[PDB]
Fold Globin-1.
Amino acid sequence: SVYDAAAQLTADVKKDLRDSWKVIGSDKKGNGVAAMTTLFADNQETIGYFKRLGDVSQGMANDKLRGHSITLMYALQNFIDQLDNPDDLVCVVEKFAVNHITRKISAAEFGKINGPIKKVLASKNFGDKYANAWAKLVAVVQAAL
Amino acid sequence: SVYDAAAQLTADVKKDLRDSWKVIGSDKKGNGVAAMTTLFADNQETIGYFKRLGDVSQGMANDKLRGHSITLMYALQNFIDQLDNPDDLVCVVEKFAVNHITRKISAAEFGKINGPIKKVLASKNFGDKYANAWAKLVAVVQAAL
Ligand code: HEM
Ligand code: HEM
């Protein structure tokens, strides 16, 4: 249940998400591409889903990958801005869930983004505490897939 | 090209876009839904394209419409944030262009959004100069359609 999942975002979790987002959200292009390049490197079996982006190994030099990556960060920005209102958070989460259901992405495979996020956070000196908070937000999307 | 259309956005135009967005972008849920409802009210022929959203006459109460509307405002947020780097603006514009090309939305039809934006701007007392500035931004996306 996406609603029960959203309820897991307690005061402490929301604070950790906001505090860490202030840092990682400041460079959407850089951290967005970093997150994607990590996903492709750690889970090569997911590259097939991104055929439209072309040669993803090119990283920042790939215009389609850069456009996709920046936009992905705005989806996260959207989630963060809706933390105050559960009903709005859920409707935006379900919107993005549809974008992935149509691409045949399961909850299990969507969860593969946790590794990349933990690594991007770690590179900014944000440890497991923050990685776990972000896993709870990702879990809300997983509940809708 | 799209790059040409973006590279032409002048300092004055960018100033007007940023000043007006400071206001209309501060209430994404409210202004996003208002923009969509106005599109359906003045251009009823577009309603069919949004069948996935269900009964759009439900307005704010329609969770699918609300989720879509909030997300549309973040696409605009994305554009505004990329104004000083045409290369990044172009790659995000092309990304959203694909979302519409796949739905068979022509450049002419995409331009139907200008009416709603003009009315939303007007509700906050931003006149013709501002509407013209936004039409130029919309024209960048049209260059990709
Ligand atoms: C924090 C997690 C993630 C977020 C917020 C997110 C967000 C997005 C957004 C905003 C889009 C563009 C939607 C569209 O225009 O159709 C997208 C596309 C896509 N996502 Fe994700 N995504 C995430 C994780 C994943 C993961 C882990 C996978 C795969 C294992 C995945 C697979 C896809 C695919 C295949 C596309 C289509 C790309 C294209 O052809 O343009 N996403 N995602
Ligand atoms: C300021 C201009 C506009 C922006 C920034 C914009 C942005 C968006 C975004 C972000 C999406 C979601 C893409 C996806 O998840 O697949 C979308 C979907 C869509 N847009 Fe637009 N759009 C604009 C104008 C228009 C206009 C004028 C039309 C029609 C005449 C249009 C038709 C569509 C359709 C049919 C969808 C698919 C809705 C669905 O089934 O979820 N858009 N748009």
About this structure: DSSP finds eight helices and no strands in chain B. Chain B touches chain A at residues 28-29, 52, 63-64, 66-68, 70-71, 74-75, 77-78, 81-82, 88, 90-92, 94-96, 98 (CB under 8 Å). The first helix of chain B runs from residue 2 to 7. The pocket of protoporphyrin IX containing FE (ligand 2) is lined by residues A 99; B 46, 49-50, 52, 68, 71-72, 75-76, 96, 99-100, 103, 105, 109-110, 112-113, 138 (CB under 6 Å).
